[PDB]
Amino acid sequence: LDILHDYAPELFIENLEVFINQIGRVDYLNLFISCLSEDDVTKTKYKETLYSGISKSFGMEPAPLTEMQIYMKKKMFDPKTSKVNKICDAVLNVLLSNPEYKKKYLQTIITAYASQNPQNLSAALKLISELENSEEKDSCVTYLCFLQDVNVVYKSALSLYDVSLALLVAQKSQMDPREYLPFLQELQDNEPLRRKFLIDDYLGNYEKALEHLSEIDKDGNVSEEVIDYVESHDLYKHGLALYRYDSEKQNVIYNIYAKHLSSNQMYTDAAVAYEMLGKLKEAMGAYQSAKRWREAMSIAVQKFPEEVESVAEELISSLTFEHRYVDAADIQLEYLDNVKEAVALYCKAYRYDIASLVAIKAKKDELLEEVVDPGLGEGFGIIAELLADCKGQINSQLRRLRELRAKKEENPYAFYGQETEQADDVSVAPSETSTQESFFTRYTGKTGGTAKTGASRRTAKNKRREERKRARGKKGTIYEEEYLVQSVGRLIERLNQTKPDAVRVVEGLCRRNMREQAHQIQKNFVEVLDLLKANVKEI
Amino acid sequence: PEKERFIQCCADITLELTDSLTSGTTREINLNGLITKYSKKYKLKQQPRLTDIINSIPDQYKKYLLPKLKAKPVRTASGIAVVAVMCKPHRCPHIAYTGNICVYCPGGPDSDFEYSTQSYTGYEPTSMRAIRARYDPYEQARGRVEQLKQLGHSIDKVEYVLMGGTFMSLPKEYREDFIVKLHNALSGFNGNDIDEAILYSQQSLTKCVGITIETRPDYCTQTHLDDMLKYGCTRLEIGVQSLYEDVARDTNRGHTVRSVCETFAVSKDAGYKVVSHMMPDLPNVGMERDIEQFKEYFENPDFRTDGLKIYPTLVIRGTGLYELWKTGRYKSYSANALVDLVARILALVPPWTRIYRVQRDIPMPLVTSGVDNGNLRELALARMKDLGTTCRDVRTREVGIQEVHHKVQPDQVELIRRDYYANGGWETFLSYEDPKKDILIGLLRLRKASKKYTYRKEFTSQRTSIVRELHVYGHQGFGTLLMEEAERIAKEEHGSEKISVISGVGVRNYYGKLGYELDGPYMSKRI
RNA sequence: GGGCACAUGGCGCAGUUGGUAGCGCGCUUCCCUUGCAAGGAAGAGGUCAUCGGUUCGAUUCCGGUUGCGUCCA
Ligand SMILES: C[C@H]1O[C@@H](n2cnc3c(N)ncnc32)[C@H](O)[C@@H]1O
Ligand code: SF4
């Protein structure tokens, strides 16, 4: 059947009216606008062999198209390009236009609306109810329930904002009438907006429910059902997408959203929302829990001249715990007013130049002998310590990465990788667990006897009894060797973190006129970073 | 306790499944596991079945949720539930005018069995159902249909079989009573008059889509055929057992092959459909003649019947064959030899002939010598595959068994039409089939009423084509297509002014919507 | 109340670090309730009650949780 279009689609589409006039029976038209399969039969298969050469392979066996394909074809399907939608829309245009066709060929239009993959049932039920009859309309409802699933069509009837049609359909759904008759009665004996809210609730259309419940009252005083609903469902985004008009009620939504965000996860949202409501103490709490010292303390000094320093104590505690000694020193010197502690944090954050600034500011050059010189000495100590420790770690890493040593070959050699030792192909079952395991595989194992996905590309892990092996196929502690870079990065992260710190500290200590140890540790650091086997052969 | 927790477990299973299925949701763990997790708290042997849970669903929910477990067309969709009954034991007619009974029929009224009808051994399930009903048709029919209902089938087209001896050799009052009782147990009407019973059964729910009456060639005269068409019979089953007259003579058969052929012609011209019995390994035959007769059966355009029943000769104690097998005068075939013979026979079955059955289901512990196993067709098809050739039987190409055994679906339906000459008549055989995979989707026989043999007052008055059989198994507007093409054939190809279909009394209303008017026992339509 | 042998297809069982998929019934399917048997054939029902480290190997090793006999003071 479908052929009749797929053969000469241009001429067909041109003369669809002639075709409809030709097809006398409504039944043929109906059951032609239902079997429209989205596949062609003239350029994908069933080739017309009139013109093909007689010596050509006329036809091979079509493939079964193993199940998995359909999965990323239905989800890849584009409901804007399919032939089904095109023919359905053409038919709709040629049928809705003429009053006589609507009078007679209604079931064709219903079939068309139910056949297009977007499933335009809204228009179908709308036109069905639009009929001014009680005989044909019920027949068409029965026809639709035979065609389309009764549950989805009943839900669409509800979404169409009608109960009489809903009750008519619900007599074809086999649900116990005790389970829907009270519902339909309650929907029937309420106001249009209450009924619409309940309708949008039953289908679960929460956004529609709220955007139709908000309009029930024209008063500037917001309702409390709306806030209860949004609190129960967490849809404040629509609250502020709907009430961009009413500032006061929008601020009410701001308040409830700020409460929600402060509770669940995140804090600067709560503070910036309290910015409108004020909510002074709550705003302060959100700001300081957000580690945003400057904004909160500005609010304090501009509002509360009594708790200015207590919040400073809380912020300095946070920054000491945050280990952000820069802003810690800043709030210590400017607000806590302690130059010595500020410089101590400066040395903690590897800062000396501004530490010298602060020591000069208090007219106190003793601070150098107090903290600054001791701080630089401690910096020299810690850089030496990290130097030795990282040197040992590098030695250990290189020793593990001594050579291929064969051992593992069954994995594609990108599993080894490790400074492009060898390339690879696809992947095999993930083997070589922590520190060079073997692959005897005489049996299938305790957790074995099934297929293995073959996933030894570079590394992998499985959930079978939840790993239970510290080596989660990852390049970290007790690493299994064989890592394509990403073990240099374990060192690159650290040396790049320390390098600005290294040059800063050595330059600061040089400024203090002990440049001997400064240049010693600088040269040792550059040597230890250079001699590292960065990637393959230091290239 | 022991079993109460089982009943309440089934109850909660039913209620929960109904609640889940009201909104359109399936189960998860094949309820028997969920059944046990609650009912086997002490593991006291409580073993439910699918029938057990089905007999728990409430009526309103049962009638609507039951078919949502079965999907094979002929099983629950086509719903031709073969419901076999039996008549009272009696002695087959020929014994009187020959001297003794057929030499191979086991059991009967004067064998070692006192209870089984003729040609039966009182151990087949049908026999125990008949005896537990005391051979009464009403109990037989009600019990069988109720057992079918209990087992979860949604049966709607009961097709009756009247097995056992020659049913046509009984006093007419008894047969009238039997048929009226069958139709009454079907419809629910409680009358006694055959005309009224038919008229009531025609409107009845659970339609009597036909009835088969196995008989003998001699007892199928014009008057007997009129009788059986009065009853509502639609398919005949005729004993033949051999085309060689010598074998029939030596078996005390009592009817010549020429009589069989004449009966075939007149019955097929009466609108019936005939299924014949074909016994291999008859005495004095041998493999050469076995193959010869089975090859001629479809080659002689005189028999060529629409159905068939291959019943390899089984010797059982007490028959006339035990006093001939014991002396060693007759030795059976070999297991491999007979399997091969069945393979070669089935290789020759034309596409229209349907193989209704193979070797009898008489129990192994009772057969003295014959077929060893009980799955002869399985081995026959395996050997067919081994030889390369394949079967064309209708039953081996219909959709229903394929969807559950072969698990192959049809996608290349096409119209095919055979046109052969059998029993002096021109028989067309329309079908919608699958040429690539040899799968038969729908079929319809058709016959040009031959002037030589037709006799019905409905047919001799004006030229007539008879739609002897229409069958659709696996949108689905096929009966319509076949019926329209048959109309076209009978109008142009046949030149027949009135085309009439023989129909079981149950289905006479279906042809009503097709424009047919009821003439006598046929659903006719002028052209 | 804690030590504690065990806890494993529906069920009683073979769960095993030299080393994990099945026994007996039970259920589903076809052959066949003489077109659908509660026989025979053929299958579905599971990687252990969770996790941590090592072994070609991991409730199987050790460790603790909920019950199943059972105490003990
Ligand atoms: C019922 C059908 O089986 C035939 N028949 C008679 N006796 C036997 C037997 N022992 N085994 C098989 N079929 C038999 C009848 O003659 C008829 O053809
Ligand atoms: S051969 Fe025919 S007539 Fe004789 S007993 Fe068997 S069925 Fe009856």
Residue numbers in the entry:
A (entry chain A): 772 to 1310
B (entry chain C): 17 to 490, 505 to 557
Paper lines:
Meanwhile, we also collected a dataset for ScElp123 in complex with yeast tRNA AlaUGC and obtained a reconstruction at an improved resolution of 3.96 Å. This new tRNA-bound structure of ScElp123 allowed us to build a more reliable atomic model of the tRNA-bound complex, which facilitated the structural comparison of individual regions in ScElp123 and MmElp123. Although we did not supplement the sample with SAM before vitrification, we identified a bound 5′-dA molecule in the yeast active site next to the cluster. Gln257 contacts one of the hydroxyl groups in 5′-dA and positions the radical carrying methyl group in close proximity to Tyr136 and Tyr327, which both are positioned in a similar distance to the base of U34 and to the methyl group of 5′-dA. Furthermore, we observed that the density of Tyr136 connects to the one of U34, suggesting direct interaction. This tyrosine possibly pulls the uridine closer to the iron-sulfur cluster and the 5′-dA molecule. As for the fourth iron atom of the cluster, it is not coordinated by any cysteine residue but it is bordered by an additional, adjacent density, which most likely can be attributed to bound methionine. Second, the ScElp123 in complex with tRNA harbors the SAM cleavage products, namely 5′-dA and methionine, in its catalytic site.
